[PDB]
């Protein structure tokens, strides 16, 4: 198996959000991932590519023979993944304390999004929920507008299973000294605080407001933004640095003798009024063309659909094609032990099979 | 130094964004983590906690040969400048694989190492643009809308940058040997958001801005204005959690369109819209305490250190001007510490004494 994780021996109990997004990139980078779901789905090959670099495998962990089985593939691995309420592992036998006494060098990961105790620790919920609580919903949008979800990115995946993904590499760090594995608890409210850290450091600086659509990052600086274009098309401007914003107006062909100072937050309104009135008159490869080479921080906002025609993509190889789609390939990169392109989801594995390979 | 990566050396070339931000979570777990300035009182950037602070001139002979004996200690090297940088002030991979054969060396950009747009200037919005990702982002009659600087440079950049440190320290282990990371926040923001391309693929998310599950389109995910103007986040997907909230707005599901009936979602955004406007931020949290109704009012920064379920796990710990995030995630046995406030630039011959020759 390609990739710097090869030989690490994964077993993720089926979830949703950032559980099986840390799997996937377990296996993206060389792992041996297998997933235990329940029978009540089964029902062929799965349509889903997240599920990609896995064995899939079936088992009533709520029966004796699921648990055991079950039990006998945690004592073989190196890490447990599991996205379940607190209390939820314990109560089938599959708990932290019942694995430490198959298995005492397993790392036991925990992907919630409000942690393991406190107020909330047993409501549901979901990314929008999570980054509501701690100040990152609300500073997402316009100004004049309620708050808008950054998709699901910031809490499952940037805040969620990215943070689960350091607990487990870093305690996998941890036990080459000690010869133990440990508990790793990772909560998405805790996660995307970190993610946010800039902000809670330029907050106590008095470099950020908490008022939306104000500050410099969060598209209340006409140089960070995206503007309309001729055709109704986007493009993004990111020219925070005086260098680069001066080289934006030179291709948008405004003098700067004629507009108001870069960073003089009081004339924002006529800047971007000018900005508007100028990018509006082009379309949006026009600016791509012009800006092709520079250091204006000018980009075409692309969508989905057109990501796979845009050169420097392409000859990156970020995306690969599967199944009536692109996909993106592992990150991030490595120069001798490069990962290999994503294996389809699989059909079901007998739970034997996978015992056996794994030595038995 | 407390935290699972307690032994850990990095050395850490000053950039922004990323890089830095990596080199803090290093340091946060516990990783003894050494930034090298450019000599041009304490640093007031709270991103800079849990560093020792050296000054050098690496342009100079004396700047360059101090920094690869650092490097040579060190486990890590983190440097966040374009292509060819490193290469040019001899601190490039195959510099510091002559003094460390051993050395992670990781490489944190935007566009990537190679190809047309690598030596072009950019910040978060600009990679989060080529690749789909900032086009998704707002609502449909409105231009695109940048999410913070949370999904290029933090999450699909710093984060990735970490997850090929800590899995390169891994394949150290049987090989013996470092090697390159290259971390594009191109490509990691692409991965991060792998579920759209995934449904994108069945059939299950569209281009259009506004009209998807998870964008805003869906009015069971969305915010909701309240009486006093104060907003609740709605994440109520699965239909009981759903059921559970319509229950405790006081509508019956009956005169309601279906969850899922997408024709008709403007019609019962407009219901939720009316009901969820009836009451203020604060009763709608109470109301839906301990359910699964998936309804959670949206707190502004200044708000959050009053949250009991904030204050009772310390999510945060009060510094010099506020509160900042503790580390994260959280470990059983070898727990992070409290993160050491941004400490006075040290001499680099202190550090190399310190980590022996
Ligand atoms: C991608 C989109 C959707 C997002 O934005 S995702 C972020 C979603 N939230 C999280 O993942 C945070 C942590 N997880 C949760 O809060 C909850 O799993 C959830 C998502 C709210 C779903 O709640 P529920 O459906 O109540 O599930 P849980 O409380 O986790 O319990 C799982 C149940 O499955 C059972 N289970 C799980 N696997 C098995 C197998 N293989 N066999 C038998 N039983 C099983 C488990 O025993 C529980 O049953 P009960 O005994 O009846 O309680
Ligand atoms: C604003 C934030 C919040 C965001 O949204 S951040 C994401 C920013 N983008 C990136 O970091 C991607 C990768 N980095 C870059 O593209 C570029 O560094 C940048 C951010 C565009 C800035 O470009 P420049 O200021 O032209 O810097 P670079 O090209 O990286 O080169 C830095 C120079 O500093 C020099 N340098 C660096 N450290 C030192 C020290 N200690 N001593 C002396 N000289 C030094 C280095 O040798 C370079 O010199 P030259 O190439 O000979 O001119």
């Not at 089985?69 to 379940?84: M, Q």
């Not at 019942?98 to 107020?119: F, H, S």
């Not at 092709?292 to 845009?310: I, K, M, Q, R, Y």
């Amino acid at each position: 198996m390609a990739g710097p994780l090869s030989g690490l021996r994964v077993v993720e109990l089926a979830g949703i959000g950032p559980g099986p997004h840390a799997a996937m990139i377990l296996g993206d980078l060389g792992a041996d991932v297998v997933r235990i779901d329940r029978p009540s789905s089964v029902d062929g090959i799965s349509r889903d590519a997240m599920l990609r670099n896995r064995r899939i495998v079936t088992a009533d962990l709520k029966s004796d023979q699921g648990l055991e089985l079950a039990l006998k593939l945690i004592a073989k691995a190196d890490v447990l993944i599991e996205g379940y309420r607190p209390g939820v592992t314990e109560r089938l036998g599959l708990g932290p304390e019942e694995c430490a006494k198959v298995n005492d060098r397993l790392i036991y990961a925990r992907m919630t999004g409000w942690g393991q105790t406190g107020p909330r620790s047993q409501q549901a919920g979901h990314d929008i929920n999570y980054i509501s609580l701690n100040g990152i919903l609300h500073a997402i949008g316009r100004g004049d507008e309620r708050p808008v979800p950054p998709l699901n990115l910031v809490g499952d995946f940037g805040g969620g299973s990215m943070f689960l993904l350091v607990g487990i590499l870093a305690a996998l760090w941890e036990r080459q000294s000690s010869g133990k594995g440990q508990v790793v608890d990772a909560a998405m409210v805790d996660g995307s605080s970190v993610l946010i850290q800039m902000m809670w450091a330029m907050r106590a600086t008095g470099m950020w407001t908490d008022t939306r659509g104000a500050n410099m990052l969060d598209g209340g600086a006409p140089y960070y933004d995206t503007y309309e274009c001729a055709d109704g098309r986007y493009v993004a401007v990111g020219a925070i640095e005086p260098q680069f914003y001066a080289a934006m107006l030179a291709g948008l062909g405004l003098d700067a003798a004629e507009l108001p100072p870069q960073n003089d937050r009081a004339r924002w309104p006529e800047l971007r009024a000018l900005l508007t009135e100028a990018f509006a008159s082009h379309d949006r490869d026009h600016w791509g063309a012009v800006f092709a080479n520079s250091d204006a921080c000018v980009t075409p906002v692309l969508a989905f659909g057109e990501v796979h025609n845009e050169p420097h993509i392409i000859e990156r190889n970020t995306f690969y094609e599967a199944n009536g789609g692109w996909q993106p390939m592992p990150a991030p990169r490595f120069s001798r032990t490069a990962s290999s392109q994503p294996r389809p989801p699989a059909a079901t594995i007998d739970i034997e099979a996978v015992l056996t390979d794994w030595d038995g």
